[PDB]
Amino acid sequence: MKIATLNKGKETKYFNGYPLIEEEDIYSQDHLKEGDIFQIVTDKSQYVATAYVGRQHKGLGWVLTYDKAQEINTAFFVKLFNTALAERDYYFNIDGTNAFRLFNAEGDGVGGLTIDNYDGHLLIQWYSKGIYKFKYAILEAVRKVFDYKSIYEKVRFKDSEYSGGFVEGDAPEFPIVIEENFTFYNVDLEDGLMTGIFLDQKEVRKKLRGQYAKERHVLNLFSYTGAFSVIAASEASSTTSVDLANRSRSLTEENFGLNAIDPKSQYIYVMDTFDFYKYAARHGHSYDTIVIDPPSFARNKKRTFSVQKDYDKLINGALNILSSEGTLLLCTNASVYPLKQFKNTIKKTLEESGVDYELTEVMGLPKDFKTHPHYKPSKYLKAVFVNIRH
Ligand SMILES: Nc1ncnc2c1ncn2[C@@H]1O[C@H](CSCC[C@H](N)C(=O)O)[C@@H](O)[C@H]1O
DSSP, X not given: OEEEEEOXXXXXXXXXXXXXXXXXXXXXXXXXXXXXXXXEXXXXXXXXXXXXXXXXXXXXXXXXXXXXXXXXXXXHHXXXXXXXXXXXXXGGTOTTOOEEEEEEGGXXXXXXXXXXXXXXXXXXXXXSHHHHTTHHHHHHHHHHHOOOSEEEEXXXXXXXXXXXXXXXXXXXXXXXXXXXXXXXXXXXXXXXSOOSOXXXXXXXXXXXXXXXXXXXXXXXXSOTTTHHHHHHTTTSSEEEEEESSTTHHHHHHHXXXXXXXXXXXXXXXXXXXXXXXXXHHHTTOOEEEEEEOXXXXXXXTTEEEEHHHHHHHHHHXXXXXXXXXXXXXXXXXXXXXXXXXXXXXHHHHHXXXXXXXXXXXXXXXXXXXXXXXXXXXXXXXXXXXXXXXX
């Protein structure tokens, strides 16, 4: 019923499957409000696609269907969910992992919607008021497609007093313990934005232990809950974790504890990564593997970090405490920060330092985090293993 018209010469990407309706690409007189279903049409009134309104950035909403006759109802989501579920048969068949993503937004057909499986406890995240409107229809479909002990939610958009919490089912006591790569972690689906682990780094964590941990001093910067450290510690001589947040210490200790690792056999520091570079370098400390996985942006009073602008500083600091033979695991999650450009920054920085280097591995989102083949920013994870000689 409601219509948005494409600007001339902007049709083609949309005809070819581009899922994000860009504000700059369309105009409408139909008063598009969050929640609204609308059709995109060319200047010559050809139907292009059906989308829903959910603004983020320069974005109006997301394409949902190319079938004019398809109504956006429970049966609609039931179909996407079954397809999403079927594409994850591997995660149901593997030992050692009971937590993974079931539905990854636009990669699975609905931008702004994610569903995670934390050992039977589902976490649904909504990235706009727009997609929230469909909560009832979506929940009915969840009930029709998925098995679960409970359902939690989080609202991942501004100006909502309600933040999320328990939805239905049998509520557990948090933290609950999940398993991934035969490694145990605490999770809390009801406390602040983050759950205690980032599932998208499942395979990166595996590789770190498998290939870059044995008998090494492993440094983990911006450690959060110490997940990288926890898994690497079964192989490393010892790990060192560094995070600015007070909580990180006890949370990290506890994760070590779940895996039969004495926290006292590991090093855990609460401080700014950049301060740690100094302290480590002043005490002549060296590490064989340095994991760097910072937030895209962070602020500490006056002090700010931007992944875009400050990554060279991260690399130079690590190098000054990396062993002659050593590996850097350089990661980001910033969708705005494309792999090409990330690799460029890494290369430039390393070339400037005069060290010998080799990008040995480049990893992206795992399969449970299905990306969209016509939307490049969906591929937001970059993890680059770099072997160093200096
Ligand atoms: N300047 C800084 N120095 C060290 N840690 C920082 C920091 N600024 C933010 N952090 C921490 O970085 C974390 C962002 S989350 C990082 C997740 C982590 N890489 C993992 O593998 O799970 C937060 O815990 C935050 O406390």
